[PDB]
Amino acid sequence: EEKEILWNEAKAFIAACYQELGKAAEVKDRLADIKSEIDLTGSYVHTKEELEHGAKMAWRNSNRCIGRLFWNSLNVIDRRDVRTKEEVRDALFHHIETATNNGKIRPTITIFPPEEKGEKQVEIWNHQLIRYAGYESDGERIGDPASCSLTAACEELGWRGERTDFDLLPLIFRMKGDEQPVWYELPRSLVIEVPITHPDIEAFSDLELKWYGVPIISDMKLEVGGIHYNAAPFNGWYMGTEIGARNLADEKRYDKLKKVASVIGIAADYNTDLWKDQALVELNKAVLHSYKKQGVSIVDHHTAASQFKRFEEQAEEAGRKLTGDWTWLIPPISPAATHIFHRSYDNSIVKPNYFYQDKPYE
Amino acid sequence: EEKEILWNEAKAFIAACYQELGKAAEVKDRLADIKSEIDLTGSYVHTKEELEHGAKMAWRNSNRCIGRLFWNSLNVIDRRDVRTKEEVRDALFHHIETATNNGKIRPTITIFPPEEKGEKQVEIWNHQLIRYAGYESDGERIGDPASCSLTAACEELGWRGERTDFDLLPLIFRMKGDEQPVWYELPRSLVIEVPITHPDIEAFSDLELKWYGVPIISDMKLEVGGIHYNAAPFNGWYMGTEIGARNLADEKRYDKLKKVASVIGIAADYNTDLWKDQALVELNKAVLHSYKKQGVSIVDHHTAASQFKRFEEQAEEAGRKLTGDWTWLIPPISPAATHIFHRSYDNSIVKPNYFYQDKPYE
Numbered sequence: 001e002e003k004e005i006l007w008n009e010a011k012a013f014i015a016a017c018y019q020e021l022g023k024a025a026e027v028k029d030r031l032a033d034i035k036s037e038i039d040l041t042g043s044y045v046h047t048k049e050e051l052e053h054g055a056k057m058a059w060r061n062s063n064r065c066i067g068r069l070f071w072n073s074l075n076v077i078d079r080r081d082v083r084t085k086e087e088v089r090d091a092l093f094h095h096i097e098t099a100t101n102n103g104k105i106r107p108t109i110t111i112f113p114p115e116e117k118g119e120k121q122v123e124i125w126n127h128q129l130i131r132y133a134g135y136e137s138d139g140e141r142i143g144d145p146a147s148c149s150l151t152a153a154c155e156e157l158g159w160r161g162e163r164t165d166f167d168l169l170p171l172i173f174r175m176k177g178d179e180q181p182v183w184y185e186l187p188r189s190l191v192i193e194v195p196i197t198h199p200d201i202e203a204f205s206d207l208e209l210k211w212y213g214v215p216i217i218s219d220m221k222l223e224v225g226g227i228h229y230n231a232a233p234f235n236g237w238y239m240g241t242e243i244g245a246r247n248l249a250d251e252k253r254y255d256k257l258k259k260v261a262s263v264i265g266i267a268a269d270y271n272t273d274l275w276k277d278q279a280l281v282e283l284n285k286a287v288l289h290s291y292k293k294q295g296v297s298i299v300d301h302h303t304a305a306s307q308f309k310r311f312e313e314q315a316e317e318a319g320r321k322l323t324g325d326w327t328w329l330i331p332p333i334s335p336a337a338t339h340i341f342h343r344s345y346d347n348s349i350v351k352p353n354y355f356y357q358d359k360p361y362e
Numbered sequence: 363e364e365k366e367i368l369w370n371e372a373k374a375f376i377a378a379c380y381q382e383l384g385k386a387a388e389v390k391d392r393l394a395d396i397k398s399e400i401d402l403t404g405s406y407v408h409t410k411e412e413l414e415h416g417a418k419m420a421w422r423n424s425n426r427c428i429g430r431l432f433w434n435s436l437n438v439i440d441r442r443d444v445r446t447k448e449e450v451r452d453a454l455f456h457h458i459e460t461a462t463n464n465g466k467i468r469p470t471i472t473i474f475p476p477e478e479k480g481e482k483q484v485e486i487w488n489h490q491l492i493r494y495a496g497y498e499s500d501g502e503r504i505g506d507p508a509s510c511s512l513t514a515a516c517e518e519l520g521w522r523g524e525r526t527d528f529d530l531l532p533l534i535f536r537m538k539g540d541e542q543p544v545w546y547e548l549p550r551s552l553v554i555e556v557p558i559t560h561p562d563i564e565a566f567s568d569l570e571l572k573w574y575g576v577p578i579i580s581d582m583k584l585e586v587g588g589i590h591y592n593a594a595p596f597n598g599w600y601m602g603t604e605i606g607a608r609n610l611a612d613e614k615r616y617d618k619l620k621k622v623a624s625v626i627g628i629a630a631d632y633n634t635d636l637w638k639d640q641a642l643v644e645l646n647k648a649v650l651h652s653y654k655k656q657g658v659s660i661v662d663h664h665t666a667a668s669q670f671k672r673f674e675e676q677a678e679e680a681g682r683k684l685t686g687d688w689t690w691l692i693p694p695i696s697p698a699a700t701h702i703f704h705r706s707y708d709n710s711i712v713k714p715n716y717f718y719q720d721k722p723y724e
C-alpha cells in the first residue's frame with residue numbers, strides 16, 4: 001500500500017510537471033525508471049528540475065497564501081546532500097543570509113533530505129527560523145506567548161533566554177540517530193530587525209516595538225510526487241497586517257492595542273469610539289512605514305490583494321483550476337475593501353503542497 | 363410527496379416547539395389533529411403560540427446573524443387575516459411605525475398568510491420596506507446601485523423618482539389573482555433618517571450623507587413546520603459596519619471612501635498610507651455617533667460580538683447545537699479583534715429558518 005501510494009502520486013506529478021516544462025515526450029521513460037527504482041529501493045529520487053518545479057507548484061497550490069502571484073520566481077536551494085548537524089546549521093544560516101539579501105528579500109526554500117520509511121533525516125523544531133522567545137511564570141508574561149512551549153523546550157536543553165520581550169530563539173533541530181536535538185544561537189549579524197516608528201506621531205517610538213525582517217516557515221512538510229520533505233524551510237516577505245494586526249495586536253500575542261491608543265492620544269474606554277479599530281490602522285501604518293524606511297521588503301494588504309487578482313487571472317489564462325481558502329485570504333483589516341472578500345474560492349487540496357505536521361515537542 | 367414533506371417537517375417542529383414551551387404532553391393529540399387536517403385540506407394551521415415561537419426559533423437558527431442573543435424577545439405580529447391590498451399596506455405601515463418606536467427600535471416581524479399550493483397570497487417586491495432608489499443611465503449613477511433593477515420596475519408601473527441620491531422607494535407588492543403589483547408612496551412621517559456627522563471633524567457634514575433608521579428585510583421566506591411564509595418582513599437595529607463599511611463604502615454601493623479621505627484631510631494616493639482603512643474607521647465612527655445623537659438604536663461590531671459570545675454560551679447551557687456562518691459573522695472591519703474570527707462554526711441548516719427566494723422582477 002505504502003509503495004502503491006508513492007507510485008500513484010509519482011505518476012500524477014511527473015505527468016503534470018513535464019507538461020508544464022514542455023517535456024511531455026520524456027514522461028514515459030522517466031516513469032519506467034521511477035517504477036524500477038521504487039521496486040528495487042522502496043523510493044525514488046527527484047531530478048533537480050523536478051524538485052525545483054515541485055516546490056514552485058507547491059507554493060502555487062497553497063490555498064491560504066495571498067502572495068502566490070510570484071510562485072514561479074521562487075529560489076530553490078537543493079540541500080539533499082547534507083549529513084551532519086554542522087551542515088544543516090550552515091545551510092540554515094545561509095538561507096537566512098541569501099533570503100534576507102540586505103533587505104531586498106528573496107523568496108527562497110532550502111530543501112533537506114526527505115523521509116525514508118517515514119523516518120526523518122532532519123527534524124527542525126523551530127516554527128520559524130527567526131522568532132522571539134516567550135515566557136510565562138508567576139503571572140509574569142514576557143515576549144511572544146506563541147513561543148512559550150518551544151522556549152521551555154530549549155531551556156531544558158541548556159539554553160537560557162535574557163527574558164527581554166524580543167529574545168531570539170536559537171536554531172533547534174534533531175538528526176536521525178540522535179536522541180536530543182542540538183541548538184545554535186543565531187548570529188545577530190544575520191538577523192535584520194525593524195524598529196517600529198510612525199510617520200506623523202513622534203511618541204510612537206516610546207512603545208519600543210520592533211519585529212524581524214524575514215518570516216521563514218520551518219515546520220511544514222513539502223510533499224512532491226509522494227516524497228515527504230519534512231524539513232524544507234521557506235520564506236517570502238511580510239504582508240504588513242501579519243505584524244500590525246496579528247503579531248503585535250492579538251490579545252494572545254503582544255497585545256499592544258491599549259498602549260497604541262494611549263500614544264496616539266485617544267481614549268480606550270468606549271466600544272463605540274472604535275478605538276481598537278483606529279489603533280489597528282495607525283499601528284499598521286507604522287509597520288509599513290518602518291519597513292520601507294529601513295529598506296526591508298514588505299507589502300500592504302491592498303497591493304497584495306491586487307497581485308492576487310492577477311494570480312487569479314493568470315490561472316484562468318493558463319487553464320489551471322484555482323483553489324483558495326477565503327478565511328485565510330481575506331486580510332484582517334478592511335477585508336471588504338479587497339476583491340477577495342466579494343467572491344468565493346474552492347478550498348480543494350491539490351498536490352504538490354505544503355502541509356502541517358505534528359510538533360516533536362508538546 | 364409534497365404532503366409527506368409537510369407531515370415530516372410538522373412532526374419535527376411540533377415536538378421541538380412543545381418541548382421548549384414545556385408542553386410536551388400535548389404533542390401526541392396536536393399531531394393527530396394536524397395529520398387529519400393535512401389529509402382533509404392538504405395543509406395545517408399554526409396556533410398563535412406555535413407561530414410566535416417558530417418565528418423566534420427561525421431567528422435563532424439564522425447562521426449569518428450576529429445579533430441572535432435576543433431571539434426570544436422578538437415581537438411577532440400575526441397578520442394571517444389580511445385579504446386586501448389596503449390591509450397589507452396598512453400592516454406594512456404599522457410595522458414600520460411600531461418597530462421604529464421613536465428610535466428605540468423593537469425587533470419585530472409581521473407574518474402574512476402562507477403559500478397554499480406553493481401559490482403566494484401576498485408577494486412583496488421590496489428587498490427592505492425602507493430603501494433608497496438607484497439609477498443608471500448614460501454614465502450617470504444616482505442613488506443606490508443595488509436598487510437599480512427594482513427602481514426600473516417601479517418606474518414601469520407609473521412611479522417616478524426625484525433622482526436624488528436618497529429617493530425613498532414606494533412599497534410594492536402583488537396580491538394573489540392580480541397580474542400587476544400595486545405601489546404606495548411611503549409617508550415621510552413614518553421614516554426616521556439620520557444625517558451623518560463626525561464627533562471631531564466638522565467638515566464631515568459637507569458630504570451630506572444620511573441613512574434610514576430601520577433595516578426591514580421583506581423578501582425572505584420564513585419556514586415553520588413545513589409551512590412557507592413567503593411574506594413575513596422582519597427588522598432589528600443596525601450594526602454600524604453594515605452602513606459605514608458596506609452601504610456607504612462599497613464601490614458597488616455609495617462608494618464614498620475617496621470623499622471621506624478628502625474631508626478628513628488625508629491623501630488618497632498611496633496604498634501603503636492605508637487611507638481606505640483610515641477613512642473606513644472614521645466613517646464608521648461617524649455612523650455610530652450620528653445614530654446615538656439622534657436617539658436611534660444601533661450597535662457597534664465589538665459590542666455585537668460580545669453579545670454573540672453570550673448567545674454561544676447560552677446555546678451550550680441550554681444543550682442546543684450552535685450553528686453559524688463564519689464568513690458572515692465576522693465584521694468587515696477589525697474582524698480579528700473579535701472572538702468570532704478566532705474560532706470556527708458549523709454552517710448546518712436547522713429549521714425553522716429564513717430563506718432566500720427568487721425575485722418576481724429581474
Ligand code: HEM
Nearest residue numbers: 059062064065066067107108234235236237238239299354
Ligand atoms: C513573497 C511574499 C509572500 C507573502 C506576502 C505571503 C503572504 C501570506 C500570508 C499573509 C499568509 C497568511 C498566513 C497567516 O495569516 O498567518 C500566507 C500563508 C501561506 N503562505 Fe505565503 N506569502 C508569501 C510567500 C510565500 C512563499 C514563498 C511560500 C512557500 C514557498 C508561501 C506559502 C504559504 C503557506 C503554505 C501559507 C499557509 C501556511 C499555513 O497553513 O498556516 N508563501 N502567505
Ligand code: HEM
Nearest residue numbers: 421424426427428429469470596597598599600601661716
Ligand atoms: C436586533 C438587531 C440585529 C442585528 C444587529 C443584526 C445583525 C445582523 C447582521 C450584521 C447581519 C449580516 C448581514 C449583512 O452583512 O448584510 C445579519 C444577518 C441576518 N440577520 Fe440579523 N440582526 C438583528 C436582528 C435580526 C432579526 C430580528 C432577524 C429575524 C427575525 C434577523 C435575521 C437575520 C438574517 C436572516 C440574516 C441573514 C440574511 C441573509 O442571508 O442575507 N436578524 N444580522
Ligand SMILES: Cc1cc(N)nc(COc2cncc(CNCCc3cccc(F)c3)c2)c1
Nearest residue numbers: 067127215216217234235236237238239242356
Ligand atoms: C512564507 C510566508 C510569507 C508570509 N508573508 N507569511 C507567511 C505566513 O504563514 C504562516 C505564518 N505563521 C504561521 C503559520 C502556520 N500557523 C499554524 C497554526 C495555526 C493554524 C490554524 C490557525 C491559526 F491561526 C494558526 C503560517 C508565510
Ligand SMILES: Cc1cc(N)nc(COc2cncc(CNCCc3cccc(F)c3)c2)c1
Nearest residue numbers: 429489577578579596597598599600601604718
Ligand atoms: C434584521 C436585520 C438586522 C440587521 N441589523 N441587519 C440585517 C442584514 O440582513 C440583510 C441585509 N441586507 C441584505 C440581506 C440579503 N442579501 C442577499 C444578497 C446577498 C447574498 C450573498 C452575499 C451578499 F453580499 C448579498 C440580508 C438584518
Ligand SMILES: C[C@H](O)[C@H](O)[C@H]1CNc2nc(N)[nH]c(=O)c2N1
Nearest residue numbers: 340341342343344689690691692
Ligand atoms: C460570497 C462572498 O463570500 C461575499 O463577499 C460575502 C462574504 N461575507 C459577507 N458577510 C456579510 N456580513 N455580508 C455580506 O454581504 C457578505 N458577503
Ligand SMILES: C[C@H](O)[C@H](O)[C@H]1CNc2nc(N)[nH]c(=O)c2N1
Nearest residue numbers: 327328329330702703704705706
Ligand atoms: C480557525 C479560525 O477561523 C481562525 O481565526 C483563522 C481565521 N483565518 C485566518 N487567517 C489568517 N490569515 N491567519 C490566521 O491565523 C487565521 N485563523
Ligand SMILES: [Cl-]
Nearest residue numbers: 215242243247
Ligand atoms: Cl509571523
Ligand SMILES: [Cl-]
Nearest residue numbers: 577604605609
Ligand atoms: Cl442594509
